[model samples]
Target: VAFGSEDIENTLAKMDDGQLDGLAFGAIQLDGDGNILQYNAAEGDITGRDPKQVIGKNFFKDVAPCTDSPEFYGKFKEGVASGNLNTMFEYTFDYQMTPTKVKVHMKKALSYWVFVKRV
Candidate 1:
């Protein structure tokens, strides 16, 4: 289901600092422009990075540099330009700190891009 713009804004507002930093999912929340908007506790512990360092950065470029390659970027752009409801993607992140298997679900929510990651 498509999330209304108002609904998305409300939901984001309802997220307290604690809630946003400690969500159950081991994934971080981001904006369409690839900015790091929120990082849950599970994500912090797993990645060993504090929100101060992660927030407001482009995840694909500044954070997960491995996904910045031409192939991944091309596929992601294609998925977005085509207005797909959802795209399932699987890849491995070879970060020197934490190599992991990344599973991503991409979808357009209103005017922003949303990604749910599973490591």
Candidate 2:
């Protein structure tokens, strides 16, 4: 199911940080300041990065500086600022083994969440 789907949203609402690995797509939990709170294995696999090392890193800076641009981080910033953070958009991640285009989803609960799947 997709991020905006009620099925996925309900699942996300019930899942704990430790259960994120159960998801088939990339899932990241973040703090209001954009620091990674929890990152799932699928996300690390998708990006060819180590999950353990990613915890506590800044998603838009150290972890994925490519996303710091306006089109990406701007949406996140706006959503977080307004406290109405349910958004989905298309994005292309680059400078890796090959470019990866993904559908990015962001939502807010007690904590913010970012989800991604291939385009």
Candidate 3:
């Protein structure tokens, strides 16, 4: 599905691995507590890290610590507590990596939460 499209949730829920991997943007699925459940190739490529290194780890705490602040992790916790999330904003990645501007999309869809980033 196209970026920023309203159908993202439905498309993601129904998308196969092949389809997800083919997308031009980053895709990550996380559990309620922020543990990584799915990490797509596009994200791996962007971060220059293997999916194996990220799967099962906490994205906010372990993988990308830059997101542990109120704007990122806090919002996630808020969403979990409220039982819903659908937000997007621009953010920068700094800490251990070159600073980069990115558009972040966070949502609670179906059985898990998803973080899609467009770099």
Candidate 4:
């Protein structure tokens, strides 16, 4: 359950929402257009947004407008466009919420996924 653990990637690639919610850190899956695919409780706890309420919502627009920018959302589109993604970086959650520095991992396979842990 270590942050930045590469081993988790294989599990994450096939995990269901129920299991995804149990992860120690934030884990979210998105569709090609940034719409929520599977949102976990850890992410919900970190963002204080209910995973049930966020499923199917636009992750960068409706759910978390703070990330609708180049540093966050832009990378997503780029990955989708190129059909490849394996990105990791740091970001601070802001906009409609208090600042929370977090390290992020973005990966893509059958679906795109984003993982985060407090920095």
Candidate 5:
């Protein structure tokens, strides 16, 4: 499925903050440098971190250190720099939190990039 769900497809198509925040999945918006621009409610709830604590931080470093690996963050940076980002894969998040299996989708919009993870 394209981006995995209807909500994610709509969010990507429209690039609306409201839709992204209202998504049932973890929605994380990031800048070119991997700095988190928006950390949605779903992400905060699943990660057990407050939105304020994640926003404005480097997601691959300060937020989710597990993603700092080559398979994740490296791919994200390459995709962003190349301007052709639409990759999805299964991943596990384990950093001060429970080992959670989730699907990761990295997409580049006109303005910023978004990471949508479905549990």
Candidate 6:
């Protein structure tokens, strides 16, 4: 039997909610100077901060202090300066919390700069 249009929409809505609750990646748009322009919902949860508190913030400015280290911030700069795209790296989160791995992908497309997930 064919499903109704509303059924399909509800299914999609459920999938969206599931993905939002589970582990997923997010988008971070940055300027040439590594300043943040956008931080989405997924990014906010992954970084344990609200997107509102993150936008208009400099990513490498120690705003996300955990990501300000050389392992993350350092190579991000290196990739841009080297004019590279699709460079992959792993960032290990360490603090008083459990250490988890966040795989990062660096890429440049058109005039847009993006830092996103590899998976």
lDDT of each: 0.58, 0.82, 0.79, 0.83, 0.74, 0.55
lDDT of 2: 0.82
TM-score of each: 0.63, 0.88, 0.90, 0.89, 0.82, 0.62
| Regions of candidate 1 where Cα sits further than 4 Å from its true position | 1-17, 110-119
Worst 10 residues of 5 by lDDT: 1-10
- Taking all chains together, the TM-score of candidate 6 against the true structure is 0.62
Compare candidates 3 and 6 on lDDT and give the better one.
3
Regions of candidate 3 where Cα sits further than 4 Å from its true position: none
Per-residue lDDT for 1-119 in model 6, tens only? 01212232233233443343343465566776767766656665555667777667777665556777677667667767777644557676554345656776555543123434433
lDDT-wise, the better of 2 and 5 is 2
- Residue-level lDDT tens digits of model 5 in 36-58: 88777778777788887777888
What's the true lDDT of residue 77 in model 4?
92
Q: lDDT of model 1 at residue 94?
A: 68
Ranking by lDDT: 4, 2, 3, 5, 1, 6
What's the residue-level lDDT of 5 in candidate 6? 24
Candidate 2: Cα lDDT at 115: 91
| Runs off by more than 4 Å, candidate 2 | 7-10
TM-score for candidate 5, please give it: 0.82
lDDT of 2 by residue, 37-103 (tens): 8888888878988888889988887878889988878888898899988888899888553689999
For model 3, where is the 10-residue window of minimal lDDT? 110-119
True-structure lDDT of candidate 5: 0.74
Deviation from native of the Cα of residue 84 in model 4, angstroms = 1.4
Q: How many steric overlaps does candidate 5 have?
A: 0
Positional deviation of 30 in candidate 2, in angstroms? 0.9
